[PDB]
Amino acid sequence: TYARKAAFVKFLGTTREVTHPMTLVNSAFGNVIARQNKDGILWMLKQIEQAL
Amino acid sequence: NLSFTDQHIKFWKKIPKQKAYSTVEQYGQLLDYGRSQGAFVGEGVLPDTNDS
């Protein structure tokens, strides 16, 4: 007896936004785009971990 | 051109411009130098104190 199976690829995503005046003001904690990207990556990692 | 130019805008070209670093700008004021009292003292006498 033999079988042939199939698996389907799924998609994950999230969106991050920063307004223009936020990019112009003097902000502590360093660059803001990098901070938002790190937050998005960590949130996606947690979502993947729970979806697994 | 039959309309106004940059020379016809008098208030914008006269007001001084300073650079801003945030969406909220703060400044300080000096309101008074001290209360009214005597300023003549005797020889070797400690004068009174005052505050702004």
PDB file of C-alpha atoms in Angstrom:
ATOM      1  CA  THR A   1       0.000   0.000   0.000  1.00  0.00           C
ATOM      2  CA  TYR A   2       1.335   3.412  -1.024  1.00  0.00           C
ATOM      3  CA  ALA A   3       0.055   6.966  -0.662  1.00  0.00           C
ATOM      4  CA  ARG A   4       0.733  10.422  -2.083  1.00  0.00           C
ATOM      5  CA  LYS A   5       0.063  13.493   0.063  1.00  0.00           C
ATOM      6  CA  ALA A   6       0.100  17.248  -0.470  1.00  0.00           C
ATOM      7  CA  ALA A   7       0.785  20.310   1.684  1.00  0.00           C
ATOM      8  CA  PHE A   8      -0.353  23.890   1.097  1.00  0.00           C
ATOM      9  CA  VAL A   9       1.762  26.990   1.725  1.00  0.00           C
ATOM     10  CA  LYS A  10       0.256  29.720   3.920  1.00  0.00           C
ATOM     11  CA  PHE A  11       1.128  33.388   4.356  1.00  0.00           C
ATOM     12  CA  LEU A  12       1.818  35.594   7.384  1.00  0.00           C
ATOM     13  CA  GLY A  13       2.251  39.348   7.568  1.00  0.00           C
ATOM     14  CA  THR A  14       1.947  42.574   9.523  1.00  0.00           C
ATOM     15  CA  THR A  15       2.172  46.280   8.699  1.00  0.00           C
ATOM     16  CA  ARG A  16       4.035  49.077  10.495  1.00  0.00           C
ATOM     17  CA  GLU A  17       3.555  52.805   9.907  1.00  0.00           C
ATOM     18  CA  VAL A  18       5.299  55.993  11.054  1.00  0.00           C
ATOM     19  CA  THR A  19       3.980  59.499  10.429  1.00  0.00           C
ATOM     20  CA  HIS A  20       6.102  62.225   8.851  1.00  0.00           C
ATOM     21  CA  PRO A  21       6.429  64.585  11.878  1.00  0.00           C
ATOM     22  CA  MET A  22       7.553  61.616  13.986  1.00  0.00           C
ATOM     23  CA  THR A  23      10.527  61.248  11.626  1.00  0.00           C
ATOM     24  CA  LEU A  24      11.507  64.924  12.019  1.00  0.00           C
ATOM     25  CA  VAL A  25      11.380  65.554  15.786  1.00  0.00           C
ATOM     26  CA  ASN A  26      14.300  64.818  18.115  1.00  0.00           C
ATOM     27  CA  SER A  27      13.573  61.369  19.561  1.00  0.00           C
ATOM     28  CA  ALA A  28      15.426  59.475  22.269  1.00  0.00           C
ATOM     29  CA  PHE A  29      16.108  55.717  22.129  1.00  0.00           C
ATOM     30  CA  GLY A  30      17.756  56.112  18.717  1.00  0.00           C
ATOM     31  CA  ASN A  31      16.260  55.636  15.281  1.00  0.00           C
ATOM     32  CA  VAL A  32      12.517  55.031  15.120  1.00  0.00           C
ATOM     33  CA  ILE A  33      12.270  52.948  11.920  1.00  0.00           C
ATOM     34  CA  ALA A  34      14.654  50.339  13.340  1.00  0.00           C
ATOM     35  CA  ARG A  35      12.677  50.219  16.596  1.00  0.00           C
ATOM     36  CA  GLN A  36       9.399  49.672  14.740  1.00  0.00           C
ATOM     37  CA  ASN A  37      10.994  46.978  12.573  1.00  0.00           C
ATOM     38  CA  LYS A  38      12.323  45.162  15.649  1.00  0.00           C
ATOM     39  CA  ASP A  39       8.892  45.319  17.287  1.00  0.00           C
ATOM     40  CA  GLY A  40       7.276  43.898  14.157  1.00  0.00           C
ATOM     41  CA  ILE A  41       9.827  41.088  13.914  1.00  0.00           C
ATOM     42  CA  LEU A  42       9.317  40.105  17.558  1.00  0.00           C
ATOM     43  CA  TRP A  43       5.524  40.179  17.209  1.00  0.00           C
ATOM     44  CA  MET A  44       5.735  37.974  14.105  1.00  0.00           C
ATOM     45  CA  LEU A  45       8.039  35.582  15.965  1.00  0.00           C
ATOM     46  CA  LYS A  46       5.534  35.223  18.808  1.00  0.00           C
ATOM     47  CA  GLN A  47       2.657  34.711  16.362  1.00  0.00           C
ATOM     48  CA  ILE A  48       4.603  32.016  14.494  1.00  0.00           C
ATOM     49  CA  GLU A  49       5.499  30.299  17.771  1.00  0.00           C
ATOM     50  CA  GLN A  50       1.859  30.128  18.856  1.00  0.00           C
ATOM     51  CA  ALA A  51       0.600  29.123  15.394  1.00  0.00           C
ATOM     52  CA  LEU A  52       3.052  26.207  15.368  1.00  0.00           C
TER      53      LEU A  52
ATOM     54  CA  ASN B   1       2.816  87.815 -13.611  1.00  0.00           C
ATOM     55  CA  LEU B   2      -0.193  90.017 -12.862  1.00  0.00           C
ATOM     56  CA  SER B   3      -0.514  88.901  -9.220  1.00  0.00           C
ATOM     57  CA  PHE B   4       1.492  89.452  -6.046  1.00  0.00           C
ATOM     58  CA  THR B   5       5.097  88.346  -5.563  1.00  0.00           C
ATOM     59  CA  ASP B   6       7.192  87.424  -2.537  1.00  0.00           C
ATOM     60  CA  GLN B   7       7.970  91.131  -2.040  1.00  0.00           C
ATOM     61  CA  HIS B   8       4.314  91.935  -1.273  1.00  0.00           C
ATOM     62  CA  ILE B   9       4.322  89.633   1.785  1.00  0.00           C
ATOM     63  CA  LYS B  10       5.778  91.943   4.424  1.00  0.00           C
ATOM     64  CA  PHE B  11       4.975  90.256   7.748  1.00  0.00           C
ATOM     65  CA  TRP B  12       6.418  86.862   6.775  1.00  0.00           C
ATOM     66  CA  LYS B  13       9.764  88.306   5.658  1.00  0.00           C
ATOM     67  CA  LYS B  14      10.165  90.482   8.771  1.00  0.00           C
ATOM     68  CA  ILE B  15       9.435  88.029  11.612  1.00  0.00           C
ATOM     69  CA  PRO B  16      12.545  86.145  12.811  1.00  0.00           C
ATOM     70  CA  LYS B  17      12.762  82.384  12.351  1.00  0.00           C
ATOM     71  CA  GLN B  18      14.141  79.841  14.825  1.00  0.00           C
ATOM     72  CA  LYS B  19      14.542  76.092  14.444  1.00  0.00           C
ATOM     73  CA  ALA B  20      12.191  73.792  16.357  1.00  0.00           C
ATOM     74  CA  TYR B  21      13.068  70.268  17.469  1.00  0.00           C
ATOM     75  CA  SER B  22       9.710  68.914  18.692  1.00  0.00           C
ATOM     76  CA  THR B  23       5.955  69.394  18.484  1.00  0.00           C
ATOM     77  CA  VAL B  24       5.953  71.181  21.873  1.00  0.00           C
ATOM     78  CA  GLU B  25       8.322  74.110  22.441  1.00  0.00           C
ATOM     79  CA  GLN B  26       9.024  75.602  25.867  1.00  0.00           C
ATOM     80  CA  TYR B  27      10.525  78.874  27.070  1.00  0.00           C
ATOM     81  CA  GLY B  28      11.084  80.744  30.312  1.00  0.00           C
ATOM     82  CA  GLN B  29      10.350  84.284  31.494  1.00  0.00           C
ATOM     83  CA  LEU B  30      11.769  86.599  34.163  1.00  0.00           C
ATOM     84  CA  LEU B  31       8.860  88.450  35.759  1.00  0.00           C
ATOM     85  CA  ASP B  32      10.405  90.510  38.571  1.00  0.00           C
ATOM     86  CA  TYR B  33      13.720  91.250  40.267  1.00  0.00           C
ATOM     87  CA  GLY B  34      12.440  91.532  43.839  1.00  0.00           C
ATOM     88  CA  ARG B  35      10.131  93.288  46.241  1.00  0.00           C
ATOM     89  CA  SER B  36      10.482  96.989  47.013  1.00  0.00           C
ATOM     90  CA  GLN B  37      12.413  97.727  50.210  1.00  0.00           C
ATOM     91  CA  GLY B  38      15.246  99.871  51.499  1.00  0.00           C
ATOM     92  CA  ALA B  39      18.737  99.520  50.065  1.00  0.00           C
ATOM     93  CA  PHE B  40      20.725 101.753  52.456  1.00  0.00           C
ATOM     94  CA  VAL B  41      22.507  99.970  55.310  1.00  0.00           C
ATOM     95  CA  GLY B  42      24.829 101.000  58.106  1.00  0.00           C
ATOM     96  CA  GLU B  43      28.518 100.249  58.426  1.00  0.00           C
ATOM     97  CA  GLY B  44      29.047  96.548  59.096  1.00  0.00           C
ATOM     98  CA  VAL B  45      25.351  95.595  58.975  1.00  0.00           C
ATOM     99  CA  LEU B  46      24.014  92.527  57.176  1.00  0.00           C
ATOM    100  CA  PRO B  47      21.519  93.546  54.460  1.00  0.00           C
ATOM    101  CA  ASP B  48      18.220  91.752  53.991  1.00  0.00           C
ATOM    102  CA  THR B  49      17.521  89.079  51.377  1.00  0.00           C
ATOM    103  CA  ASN B  50      15.315  89.161  48.291  1.00  0.00           C
ATOM    104  CA  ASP B  51      13.977  86.763  45.665  1.00  0.00           C
ATOM    105  CA  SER B  52      12.899  86.874  42.020  1.00  0.00           C
TER     106      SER B  52
END
